[PDB]
Amino acid sequence: AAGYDRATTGYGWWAGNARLTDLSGQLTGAHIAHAGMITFWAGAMTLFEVSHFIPEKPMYEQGSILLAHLAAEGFGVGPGGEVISTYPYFVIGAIHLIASAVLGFGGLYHTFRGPAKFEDYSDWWGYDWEDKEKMMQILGIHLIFLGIGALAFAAKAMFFGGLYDPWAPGGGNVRLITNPTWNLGTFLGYITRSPWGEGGWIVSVNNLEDVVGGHLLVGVHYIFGGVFHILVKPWGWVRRAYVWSGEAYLSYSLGALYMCGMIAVGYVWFNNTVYPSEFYGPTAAEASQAQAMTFLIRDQRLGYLMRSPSGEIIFGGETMRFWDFRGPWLEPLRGPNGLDLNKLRNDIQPWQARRAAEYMTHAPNYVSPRSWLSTSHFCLAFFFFVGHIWHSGRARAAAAGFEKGIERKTEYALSLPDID
Amino acid sequence: MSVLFQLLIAAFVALSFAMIIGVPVVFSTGDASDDANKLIWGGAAAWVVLLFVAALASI
Amino acid sequence: VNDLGAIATALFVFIPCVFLILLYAQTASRG
Amino acid sequence: KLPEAFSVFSPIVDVMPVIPLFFLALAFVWQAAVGFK
Amino acid sequence: MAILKFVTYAWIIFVISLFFFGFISSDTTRNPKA
Amino acid sequence: RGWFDVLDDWLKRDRFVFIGWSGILLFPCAFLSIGGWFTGTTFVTSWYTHGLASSYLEGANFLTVAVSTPADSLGHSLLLLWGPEAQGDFTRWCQLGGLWNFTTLHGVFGLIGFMLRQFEIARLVGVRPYNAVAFSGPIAVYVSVFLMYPLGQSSWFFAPSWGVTSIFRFLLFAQGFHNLTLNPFHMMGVAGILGGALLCAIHGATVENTLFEDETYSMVTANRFWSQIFGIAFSNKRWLHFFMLFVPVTGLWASAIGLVGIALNMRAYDFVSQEIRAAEDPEFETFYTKNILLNEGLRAWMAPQDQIHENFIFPEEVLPRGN
Amino acid sequence: SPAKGGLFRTGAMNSGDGIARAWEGHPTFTDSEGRELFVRRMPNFFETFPVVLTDKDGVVRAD
Amino acid sequence: IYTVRWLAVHTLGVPLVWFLGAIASMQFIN
Amino acid sequence: MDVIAYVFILACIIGLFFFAVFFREKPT
Amino acid sequence: ASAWERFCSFITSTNNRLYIGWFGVLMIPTLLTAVTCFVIAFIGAPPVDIDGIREPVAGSLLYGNNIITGAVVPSSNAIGLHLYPIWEAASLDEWLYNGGPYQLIIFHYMIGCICYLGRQWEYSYRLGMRPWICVAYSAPLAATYSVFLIYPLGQGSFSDGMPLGISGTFNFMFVFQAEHNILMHPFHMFGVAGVLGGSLFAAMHGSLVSSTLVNSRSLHFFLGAWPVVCIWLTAMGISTMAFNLNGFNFNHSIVDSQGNVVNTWADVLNRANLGFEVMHERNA
Amino acid sequence: SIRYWIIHTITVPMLFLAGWLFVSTGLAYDVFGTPRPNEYFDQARQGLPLVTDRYEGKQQIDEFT
Amino acid sequence: LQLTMLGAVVIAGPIVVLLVALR
Ligand code: CL7
Ligand SMILES: CC1=CCCC(C)(C)[C@H]1/C=C/C(C)=C/C=C/C(C)=C/C=C/C=C(C)/C=C/C=C(C)/C=C/C1=C(C)CCCC1(C)C
Ligand SMILES: CC1=CCCC(C)(C)[C@H]1/C=C/C(C)=C/C=C/C(C)=C/C=C/C=C(C)/C=C/C=C(C)/C=C/C1=C(C)CCCC1(C)C
Ligand SMILES: CC1=CCCC(C)(C)[C@H]1\C=C/C(C)=C/C=C/C(C)=C/C=C/C=C(C)/C=C/C=C(C)/C=C/C1=C(C)CCCC1(C)C
Ligand SMILES: [Fe+2]
């Protein structure tokens, strides 16, 4: 073999993949194989969780996370967060396993059998990193695919079964969204909402109409942006404000992924709408408020609230930190200024009173799916931030030329005027 | 045909494992390509056909 | 608090400080 | 629980999730074969 | 208060814009080797 | 050439490891200390001294095995295998906690042997023995914690039992009863250790990032970088490395003096003006006062079981709570 | 006791609990039933102790 | 053949192996 | 008056930082 | 020599006494704001209702405290994660009473820290050296973001954040131990190993170099890498504990054959945690 | 090489079994005084056997035994 | 019970390595 050793590449075995920078075919094979890995994991974990599923216990008590994602989309669920049959989960897992098989075959084929460098075979598939137009077009194509995917999710929510809306009457129910939001004022109010406790940036969405409309809007934009990238050149200032190499593009992707990971943690930890509490269990706010309300129920049966800093009616104790929390089982007992005591006196329907205790027990011995997802993806996001810094610095230095060390005889610091 | 279905899936697993072992060796080393290429592509084709057959044989 | 607390703190601040400043001054005067 | 047709293959699925880890380990085994050149 | 809020917002916007336009102003030509 | 010269040359001869004269003290003592710990964790239990199950036979975990300290009634008896306590009976020696004394004393002599060994090696190679002076810090910590502290207390029972969770118990006990975190010497120790880690990290990163494209790194670039980024920088290499040596050792010595102080209950437990001012009015509340309350709670909730020999009986009424 | 001091509690002991002048005499405690109980003495370790008057037989009576 | 290294290796390994066996035996105790 | 002692020591530290930054003898 | 170009050449210039750079453009105002507010609120600032219970807790120098016991109290429990800008406050005295200065300080300080990391990278670039000092600096950055930002987010309010004071830090440590048993979490054990081993390796390296000076490159690489990796791990451990994913728990593990329970050291540790916790939790 | 393999094969498993039997045959409990799982308490002897005297500790344990 | 399939996969991997390793 040639080019698979340190001498012929300069990279130690522990940096072996670096050798793939300019071998287009094998690099593509590696990407395809890795995608196969991801989808294989998806299918295998789905099948595992189905094989260990137990219909009586809740998903969050049972300890399944890939199943809860499908349950949110409503595949084989019923009103009040009840499964009807675990068959569609098996269907999805099997499809993913088969797709993984195909992708792995393609990855092996390009890794070993197929052409090593597509530039030799053709020119549409032969690309060099420092070709700005080619990279623009590839980015555009993949953007178009993402847009089709987002529109597909919206189409499912509108025509094919819909989503499990947990704001349907009498507990959650699988619904088909028919009135998507499209007012641009709503979209701007969502974007320019404060990320702080003063609302929530995008994590504060609470109705499914906004979710479906947002996916519609983003899919349209992704398709349009992909077309734009295919059809135009990078502007001069754009050409002068970036670094054009493989590692630089990798660093940009890493930064984007770090941002997305943090936002996903925020979603899974603060959102009870697009992550229904019926499946992932109660959020920390929901758990605290349910505990407070259940204690209040018991104390009103045997014969505690307070004023907010703005003066509304809220619960008392530590739970005051969750004074603004909104929930499906708690929303009916609302009022113009906080939950009225009179409402709590005689408006507690049985299912809400059952949900309160059921959530009080399962406060995130027992670890909620929210805890697993939040911790894992916070750690992943942090490490991807570190990777973004590493690769961005390396890209900037390598483009400049001083990546492999300072030059002994032309050292730049030796020429600067002493500051003292 | 339930037992038929189970036997079919068992054969599918057998073929899939055989392809798992064979494919890296066939693809990486094209020294015996004359029969190896036929072997590997025929295994892939049989894999596809068996999957499609099982698709209906489920119902 | 201790009436001698302030005095102890002041002397702790001062004595090593004047020692060090004296050493540096009689160093810097010399070439 | 698996579809009653597929239940026979229950043990196999039990080892599916941890398969990706092996791939990573496999790399070093590969780098073990070539002797880390 | 209103003056303080306006001044803070103006300052934040100004500094952010300075940062952005600085980093787009071809700061890939500031390295020594260039 | 008498027998002594033959023995000396034989000791100094090159092997896989270097023995030297120091080895005669180090290797047997180190080996015995390690073996004592392994035996104490594997087989001997502390059911009779602390009323605990701290051995694998008992079914403990790696994080819960411990060579627990002798009983309280023995005071500071050396617990020789042939002493008035054991009287030659191995089983009673183990049950009474003699393995703790065995391990700790042989550890002391192993540390002494190691310092002597570093002296000897530096003498052979012919370089300044800064390594021995550096190692002087760990010996200070060891002597202060495992010997001087239990010697200033009622018994060996208050020494740190060789383990993991036992050491954690020692840390929490020290906070509860001596309020160690508020001790200034422990603060200097913490600053020394954290500064040593900081120095290691930034020195490594700097040397890696000012490497010449072939000592071996651009001291001029490093100096300018740190001067214009942080404000100050080392312009001297010898000073840089002596400082790296000096900081953690000094932290260890300061902490050692802090630990010998608390061995005599000469502890900085409270600030008088704060206690007076809290006595005058009950509204005055600061973080130090709440730390005091936490110490009261930890003492009350840990004493009945930690010091089981004292037969403490505190009812639910006297146990401090946040009501 | 020399094990009840502090590192920065300065001066003579009489600057502490003050100077003694007279011994109030040995006290004895009795409860409603007339049983004679005793107060457990604070060991050297504790900066504060929970006051517990216990029966001589080892049963806590009052506190 | 009784080199000092032989002594060292055996003084380590012998009790090590014995204790490994003992711990294994404890693992199968109910 | 303790506040004065603390604040004076702190101000001396800040002055030391100023002099150590802008008035160090030039390395050479 | 466009005015904009002249400005850029001024800021991105290696002839200032302290490098500014574009990241420093954000670093300087935020750090100055944080320092100024910290000094002001540490010398004199009203008591803060930390528990959100109309009962205050003082932490300033002019209100009685000294350096060891003084602190800047975290924002009130009632605020939660709400930003509390001055202009969003009912009255200045009230705004102090709820703990706004803590929020001001920590937010400006965190922004300044991340911009300081960026500035480190930028100057490493401007001088022509490999740009990985910032990667090493990212570890203590992660630790601060853990105690000040991520832990309150997981806990729902900034009242659970770390106080800005010497004794406040210890109070935070003890409450954290009580509620999460951090000692028996493996990541904190990695962090302890990291700091102690970093000091060990620093002492060894310094002694060796200063003794003989009267792949070797991999030595300095390992020096740089070890404590940084361990600090990353322990920061991640704190972050995980911010989402109620607590450490190990071996209480009530060994039981007598008939059915009794025999104590182990873990039970003593749990009882100490119990004491710390029951002294916490004012009511229930 | 080869020669020592015979010796180690003959010996090492014998040592392993030596430790195994030392635990299994209950000898360790006698050697180290470690209580059997039923010896922690009798059916009601739930009091703890804690030594209260330095001078006659071994005999006091013999009473506790 | 389940160690059979896990062992089968453990055989499957390095065997795939070895068959290439022979040539
Ligand atoms: C942690 C920071 C980090 C991130 C997140 C990151 N990289 Mg790198 N990275 C690359 C791609 C990459 C991609 C596609 C990518 C995003 O998907 C990332 N990276 C991301 C390649 C281009 C290039 C070559 C990489 C290469 O050739 O090989 C990678 C090397 C190794 C040893 C992989 C083994 C992984 C470690 C054992 C970690 C173990 C984690 C654990 C298993 C998780 C499960 C828990 C377990 C306990 C059960 C690269 C490098 C490299 C480094 C370094 C230091 C990094 N990185 C760092 C990162 C090169 O030297 C090096 C470099 O550039 O030298 C020139
Ligand atoms: C879809 C969805 C579902 C739920 C409902 C909801 C309404 C929330 C809906 C959301 C719709 C939303 C929020 C749409 C809006 C998305 C927005 C505003 C995304 C904006 C992201 C901002 C970004 C990248 C910033 C990019 C700036 C960058 C890179 C830096 C650029 C430059 C600098 C300074 C350095 C060098 C490189 C360059 C180019 C010169
Ligand atoms: C290493 C590690 C990290 C990665 C995972 C992995 C599982 C591999 C893990 C390894 C775990 C395992 C199984 C470790 C096994 C460790 C053990 C028990 C080593 C023990 C060796 C035993 C020794 C010396 C005992 C020596 C005993 C001596 C002298 C006795 C001294 C005596 C005493 C105590 C009383 C008086 C009489 C006498 C004879 C003087
Ligand atoms: C590697 C290593 C680590 C440290 C360095 C050291 C030198 C010590 C070296 C030493 C020893 C070690 C740990 C070796 C590890 C070897 C291993 C576990 C190799 C295993 C690789 C496993 C692989 C591919 C499995 C791929 C499975 C696939 C596709 C899918 C299979 C299938 C699925 C799941 C659907 C059903 C049918 C079937 C066929 C079961
Ligand atoms: Fe060095």
Side-chain angles (χ1 to χ4, degrees):
Chain A
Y4 301 92
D5 290 54
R6 201 178 104 184
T8 50
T9 54
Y11 300 107
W13 64 268
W14 46 273
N17 287 330
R19 306 162 179 171
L20 291 183
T21 307
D22 294 56
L23 304 199
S24 165
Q26 299 194 22
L27 188 50
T28 310
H31 287 73
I32 303 160
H34 178 277
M37 271 177 181
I38 299 176
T39 167
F40 170 84
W41 177 87
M45 206 62 192
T46 316
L47 291 195
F48 186 107
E49 296 187 5
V50 177
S51 95
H52 292 35
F53 187 81
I54 303 171
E56 46 258 34
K57 307 175 63 181
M59 297 199 184
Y60 48 101
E61 182 185 51
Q62 195 192 281
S64 303
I65 50 179
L66 284 205
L67 256 49
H69 281 114
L70 305 177
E73 302 183 3
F75 287 96
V77 303
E82 189 169 9
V83 180
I84 56 106
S85 78
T86 66
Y87 187 63
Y89 306 146
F90 184 91
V91 172
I92 301 297
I95 296 172
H96 278 107
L97 266 168
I98 303 308
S100 64
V102 169
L103 292 169
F105 177 81
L108 272 299
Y109 164 62
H110 286 259
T111 313
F112 301 106
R113 176 53 180 91
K117 308 166 60 172
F118 294 159
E119 303 77 347
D120 310 334
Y121 159 75
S122 178
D123 291 318
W124 170 249
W125 309 101
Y127 67 96
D128 200 317
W129 293 114
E130 305 159 44
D131 299 11
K132 313 189 191 68
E133 297 182 294
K134 194 60 176 300
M135 302 306 107
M136 283 284 182
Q137 295 170 36
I138 298 177
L139 164 54
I141 304 172
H142 299 165
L143 284 178
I144 292 178
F145 274 91
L146 284 187
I148 300 180
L151 291 188
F153 173 73
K156 149 151 186 58
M158 290 172 59
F159 305 115
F160 309 152
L163 316 171
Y164 180 92
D165 180 6
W167 298 85
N173 183 4
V174 46
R175 191 152 67 89
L176 278 89
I177 289 308
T178 50
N179 182 4
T181 311
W182 196 255
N183 172 26
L184 72 310
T186 311
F187 288 159
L188 283 203
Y190 268 145
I191 299 180
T192 70
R193 236 179 194 85
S194 153
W196 311 97
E198 304 290 319
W201 183 43
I202 55 177
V203 189
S204 55
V205 55
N206 63 336
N207 64 85
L208 282 191
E209 286 74 24
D210 297 1
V211 173
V212 181
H215 287 79
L216 226 43
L217 194 278
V218 301
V220 171
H221 277 68
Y222 272 114
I223 302 176
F224 168 83
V227 156
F228 177 87
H229 286 85
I230 302 175
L231 296 186
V232 311
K233 284 191 312 168
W235 307 122
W237 62 276
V238 164
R239 301 202 320 270
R240 295 188 294 272
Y242 276 100
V243 188
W244 303 84
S245 53
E247 191 150 5
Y249 312 151
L250 175 54
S251 55
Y252 308 146
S253 311
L254 289 186
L257 285 200
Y258 140 70
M259 177 183 174
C260 296
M262 300 304 312
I263 299 171
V265 170
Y267 256 113
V268 71
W269 185 260
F270 294 108
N271 188 287
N272 60 13
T273 301
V274 310
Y275 297 101
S277 305
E278 294 78 316
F279 314 122
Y280 305 88
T283 64
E286 204 164 7
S288 186
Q289 305 289 45
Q291 162 171 342
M293 202 194 78
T294 293
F295 274 73
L296 172 137
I297 283 179
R298 188 195 58 171
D299 299 328
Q300 191 183 236
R301 181 185 179 180
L302 310 177
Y304 207 115
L305 312 184
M306 66 180 299
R307 287 291 166 167
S308 66
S310 297
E312 315 187 283
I313 322 287
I314 70 183
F315 288 83
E318 280 281 308
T319 185
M320 69 169 59
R321 65 179 52 173
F322 311 112
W323 68 267
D324 72 90
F325 149 80
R326 310 290 291 278
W329 54 259
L330 190 67
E331 197 62 37
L333 317 187
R334 269 301 161 183
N337 300 332
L339 66 171
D340 190 309
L341 169 48
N342 174 81
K343 305 285 182 54
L344 309 201
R345 288 172 200 172
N346 49 11
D347 298 342
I348 308 174
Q349 288 195 20
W351 63 276
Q352 321 176 0
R354 299 160 78 255
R355 279 192 183 275
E358 188 167 355
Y359 285 160
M360 187 197 68
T361 70
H362 292 56
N365 307 101
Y366 174 75
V367 38
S368 177
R370 293 178 193 274
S371 281
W372 291 112
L373 292 177
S374 313
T375 57
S376 47
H377 290 80
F378 182 83
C379 296
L380 285 170
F382 168 69
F383 284 152
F384 268 67
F385 163 67
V386 164
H388 163 62
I389 278 179
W390 170 279
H391 279 298
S392 58
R394 180 152 206 277
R396 202 107 164 186
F402 45 59
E403 166 63 12
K404 316 190 74 64
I406 309 187
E407 201 59 279
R408 269 199 159 278
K409 301 124 288 183
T410 44
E411 168 162 8
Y412 178 72
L414 283 174
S415 312
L416 305 189
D418 292 357
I419 45 186
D420 314 312
Chain B
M1 278 177 49
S2 55
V3 200
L4 163 65
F5 182 70
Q6 280 103 49
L7 183 49
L8 291 160
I9 272 60
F12 195 10
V13 169
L15 172 64
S16 305
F17 186 95
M19 295 307 298
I20 274 189
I21 277 190
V23 163
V25 194
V26 179
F27 269 162
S28 49
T29 71
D31 79 313
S33 62
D34 292 335
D35 297 9
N37 289 10
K38 270 70 176 191
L39 277 164
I40 188 169
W41 282 68
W47 201 92
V48 180
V49 169
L50 195 45
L51 158 68
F52 189 86
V53 167
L56 184 58
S58 58
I59 69 177
Chain C
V1 291
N2 193 334
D3 291 333
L4 290 181
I7 305 192
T9 302
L11 229 55
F12 192 96
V13 172
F14 215 69
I15 298 183
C17 274
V18 307
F19 167 83
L20 282 163
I21 295 161
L22 190 139
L23 282 188
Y24 170 61
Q26 70 98 51
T27 316
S29 88
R30 209 186 301 107
Chain D
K1 191 58 175 304
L2 282 178
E4 210 59 31
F6 298 84
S7 46
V8 195
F9 327 107
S10 303
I12 317 295
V13 184
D14 277 323
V15 315
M16 289 197 192
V18 304
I19 291 203
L21 294 165
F22 292 154
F23 276 102
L24 179 48
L26 177 61
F28 300 91
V29 183
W30 193 78
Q31 279 293 301
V34 300
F36 298 84
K37 41 71 157 298
Chain E
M1 286 299 173
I3 296 177
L4 180 56
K5 177 176 182 171
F6 178 89
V7 165
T8 284
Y9 271 47
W11 180 269
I12 300 172
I13 292 185
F14 165 62
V15 160
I16 288 182
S17 305
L18 250 198
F19 181 82
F20 165 74
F21 285 108
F23 265 136
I24 80 179
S25 302
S26 309
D27 271 328
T28 49
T29 63
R30 305 295 191 281
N31 60 100
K33 300 284 186 176
Chain F
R1 171 157 297 205
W3 60 270
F4 194 95
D5 297 77
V6 186
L7 174 56
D8 189 68
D9 297 327
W10 183 91
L11 294 175
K12 303 181 171 188
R13 277 175 51 257
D14 268 357
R15 295 179 181 81
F16 66 124
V17 308
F18 169 73
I19 294 189
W21 289 90
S22 55
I24 302 187
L25 177 60
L26 164 62
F27 292 130
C29 284
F31 173 63
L32 285 180
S33 184
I34 296 176
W37 182 75
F38 271 123
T39 304
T41 60
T42 307
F43 298 109
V44 175
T45 186
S46 45
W47 173 244
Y48 296 83
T49 72
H50 299 53
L52 301 175
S54 71
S55 195
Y56 289 118
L57 284 192
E58 269 50 42
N61 194 9
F62 163 74
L63 294 187
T64 52
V65 293
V67 182
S68 191
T69 42
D72 182 286
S73 61
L74 311 190
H76 306 89
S77 60
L78 299 170
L79 273 185
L80 312 169
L81 179 57
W82 54 86
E85 313 89 4
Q87 315 213 5
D89 182 284
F90 180 85
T91 291
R92 303 312 183 280
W93 188 63
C94 290
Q95 281 173 314
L96 283 170
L99 273 182
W100 191 90
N101 292 20
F102 184 91
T103 295
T104 299
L105 298 191
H106 292 77
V108 157
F109 283 109
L111 298 191
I112 289 189
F114 193 79
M115 187 165 182
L116 287 166
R117 162 181 173 98
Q118 286 178 330
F119 273 137
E120 199 175 9
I121 284 191
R123 182 63 278 183
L124 287 193
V125 177
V127 283
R128 294 167 184 183
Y130 286 143
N131 201 340
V133 177
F135 189 73
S136 62
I139 296 194
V141 176
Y142 189 89
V143 165
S144 180
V145 174
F146 288 93
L147 300 189
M148 300 199 58
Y149 182 81
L151 276 174
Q153 296 293 341
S154 166
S155 149
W156 299 117
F157 171 86
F158 300 88
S161 304
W162 290 106
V164 175
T165 313
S166 65
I167 295 291
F168 295 154
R169 168 263 175 201
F170 180 74
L171 300 184
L172 284 200
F173 182 104
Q175 173 56 19
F177 291 83
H178 302 290
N179 197 29
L180 181 54
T181 38
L182 219 70
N183 190 312
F185 299 97
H186 176 252
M187 297 176 178
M188 275 188 295
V190 170
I193 284 312
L194 294 178
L198 197 163
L199 269 172
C200 174
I202 84 180
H203 177 59
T206 298
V207 171
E208 289 309 312
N209 298 159
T210 48
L211 287 173
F212 279 119
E213 193 170 49
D214 290 55
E215 202 81 276
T216 171
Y217 60 101
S218 170
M219 190 78 183
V220 198
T221 318
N223 160 270
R224 185 168 200 91
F225 175 82
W226 283 117
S227 291
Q228 298 210 274
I229 282 295
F230 185 48
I232 52 99
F234 295 88
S235 48
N236 186 11
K237 199 158 302 188
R238 194 191 81 260
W239 173 237
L240 167 69
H241 296 79
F242 178 79
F243 191 74
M244 291 189 62
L245 154 72
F246 173 92
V247 175
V249 171
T250 312
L252 287 199
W253 275 97
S255 52
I257 270 71
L259 240 286
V260 59
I262 79 173
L264 304 184
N265 297 10
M266 297 288 300
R267 52 195 166 189
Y269 183 85
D270 52 336
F271 290 106
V272 294
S273 64
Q274 312 278 321
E275 307 294 272
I276 302 175
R277 203 150 172 174
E280 258 80 63
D281 62 289
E283 286 189 344
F284 179 71
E285 195 175 8
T286 55
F287 279 111
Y288 152 79
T289 66
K290 306 192 298 177
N291 288 332
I292 292 280
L293 303 195
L294 297 182
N295 295 347
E296 278 176 347
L298 188 130
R299 278 195 304 259
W301 288 87
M302 175 199 281
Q305 319 180 354
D306 196 338
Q307 310 179 13
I308 180 60
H309 71 274
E310 284 301 321
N311 295 83
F312 281 141
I313 301 182
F314 305 154
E316 328 177 76
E317 318 300 339
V318 313
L319 290 188
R321 292 199 187 90
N323 319 274
Chain G
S1 183
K4 288 295 299 188
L7 185 48
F8 299 94
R9 296 174 188 173
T10 72
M13 315 182 71
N14 307 315
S15 309
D17 62 345
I19 169 163
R21 296 290 167 77
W23 160 53
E24 295 180 355
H26 166 93
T28 45
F29 299 83
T30 169
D31 68 74
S32 67
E33 206 180 348
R35 341 179 74 264
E36 179 56 47
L37 44 280
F38 311 84
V39 190
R40 172 77 108 97
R41 293 189 139 187
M42 162 196 297
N44 268 314
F45 251 103
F46 291 62
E47 284 285 79
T48 65
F49 205 59
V51 181
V52 165
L53 294 82
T54 180
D55 176 18
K56 36 81 57 187
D57 220 19
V59 201
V60 174
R61 284 296 176 254
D63 70 76
Chain H
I1 205 180
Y2 286 160
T3 64
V4 177
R5 187 177 72 158
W6 181 95
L7 185 61
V9 169
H10 285 46
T11 54
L12 275 168
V14 172
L16 155 71
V17 164
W18 164 284
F19 276 68
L20 285 172
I23 299 161
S25 173
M26 303 168 201
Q27 295 323 119
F28 291 111
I29 288 313
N30 293 343
Chain I
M1 66 138 301
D2 309 10
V3 188
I4 298 185
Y6 306 152
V7 170
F8 176 75
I9 291 174
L10 198 83
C12 295
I13 295 182
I14 291 308
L16 177 59
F17 290 171
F18 162 85
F19 281 95
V21 170
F22 300 111
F23 290 88
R24 62 197 190 104
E25 172 199 324
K26 186 183 57 176
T28 301
Chain J
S2 168
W4 172 252
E5 197 284 333
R6 164 115 192 182
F7 192 25
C8 294
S9 309
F10 156 69
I11 278 181
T12 61
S13 55
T14 84
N15 288 344
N16 298 321
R17 181 52 187 85
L18 299 176
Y19 180 77
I20 317 180
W22 302 114
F23 275 111
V25 163
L26 281 76
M27 195 198 61
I28 298 179
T30 48
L31 291 189
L32 283 184
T33 299
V35 171
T36 306
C37 185
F38 172 76
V39 160
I40 294 178
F42 190 81
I43 291 185
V48 171
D49 182 18
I50 181 53
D51 292 312
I53 201 55
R54 273 64 56 188
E55 173 189 1
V57 161
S60 43
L61 285 198
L62 292 178
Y63 281 60
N65 289 103
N66 52 341
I67 317 287
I68 299 314
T69 70
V72 179
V73 176
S75 61
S76 166
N77 196 88
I79 308 175
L81 299 170
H82 294 1
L83 197 71
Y84 203 17
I86 313 189
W87 53 80
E88 295 281 318
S91 52
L92 183 273
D93 308 77
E94 184 178 332
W95 182 73
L96 305 178
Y97 184 75
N98 302 265
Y102 173 82
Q103 282 200 338
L104 195 80
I105 297 166
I106 67 173
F107 293 141
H108 290 76
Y109 154 75
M110 283 183 279
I111 301 182
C113 284
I114 197 95
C115 295
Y116 178 86
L117 172 146
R119 173 168 165 277
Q120 263 185 341
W121 164 81
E122 192 183 329
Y123 198 46
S124 62
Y125 181 61
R126 261 61 167 177
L127 283 193
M129 31 186 284
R130 302 134 54 79
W132 294 322
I133 315 277
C134 47
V135 178
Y137 171 64
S138 63
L141 177 62
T144 69
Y145 268 73
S146 303
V147 299
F148 288 141
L149 190 66
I150 314 302
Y151 188 63
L153 279 184
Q155 296 304 310
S157 152
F158 293 104
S159 59
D160 286 6
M162 197 184 74
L164 309 176
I166 284 179
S167 296
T169 295
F170 307 131
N171 180 265
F172 174 84
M173 298 176 80
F174 305 139
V175 177
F176 200 108
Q177 165 65 23
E179 289 184 331
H180 306 281
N181 185 23
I182 187 191
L183 285 185
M184 306 220 53
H185 188 302
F187 280 172
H188 173 258
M189 311 166 85
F190 273 78
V192 166
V195 287
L196 293 175
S199 298
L200 194 161
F201 302 146
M204 292 208 65
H205 177 68
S207 56
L208 284 185
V209 167
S210 51
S211 67
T212 79
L213 226 52
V214 297
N215 313 116
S216 166
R217 171 192 302 183
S218 185
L219 164 63
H220 275 96
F221 168 76
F222 167 78
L223 279 194
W226 168 271
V228 174
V229 171
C230 305
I231 291 297
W232 282 339
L233 286 180
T234 183
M236 289 303 102
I238 287 295
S239 305
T240 63
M241 266 168 281
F243 300 108
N244 294 24
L245 178 46
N246 302 320
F248 289 150
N249 196 351
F250 298 135
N251 311 330
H252 190 173
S253 298
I254 297 181
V255 290
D256 195 292
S257 49
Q258 45 178 295
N260 303 92
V261 175
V262 179
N263 265 334
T264 69
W265 286 109
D267 311 338
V268 182
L269 184 58
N270 174 30
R271 277 279 312 189
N273 293 336
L274 250 185
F276 266 152
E277 200 182 43
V278 300
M279 280 307 303
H280 193 220
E281 193 65 23
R282 317 297 289 188
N283 293 81
Chain K
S1 68
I2 301 176
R3 162 181 51 176
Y4 78 117
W5 267 106
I6 273 71
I7 317 187
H8 298 358
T9 49
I10 299 305
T11 41
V12 160
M14 190 161 56
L15 303 175
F16 197 109
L17 290 182
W20 182 291
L21 306 163
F22 167 79
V23 168
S24 66
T25 56
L27 193 61
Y29 294 73
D30 187 38
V31 165
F32 294 100
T34 294
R36 309 267 174 164
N38 296 32
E39 288 181 338
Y40 292 74
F41 326 95
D42 307 40
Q43 206 56 41
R45 205 195 64 180
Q46 288 294 140
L48 302 201
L50 309 158
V51 179
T52 61
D53 180 41
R54 160 180 179 171
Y55 311 143
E56 321 291 341
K58 61 197 310 294
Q59 322 287 344
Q60 179 173 156
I61 298 173
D62 298 356
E63 301 142 47
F64 276 144
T65 315
Chain L
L1 277 162
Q2 52 185 344
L3 293 182
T4 52
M5 336 306 183
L6 181 59
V9 177
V10 169
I11 298 307
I15 274 296
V16 157
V17 173
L18 177 61
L19 300 197
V20 195
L22 287 201
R23 296 93 80 96

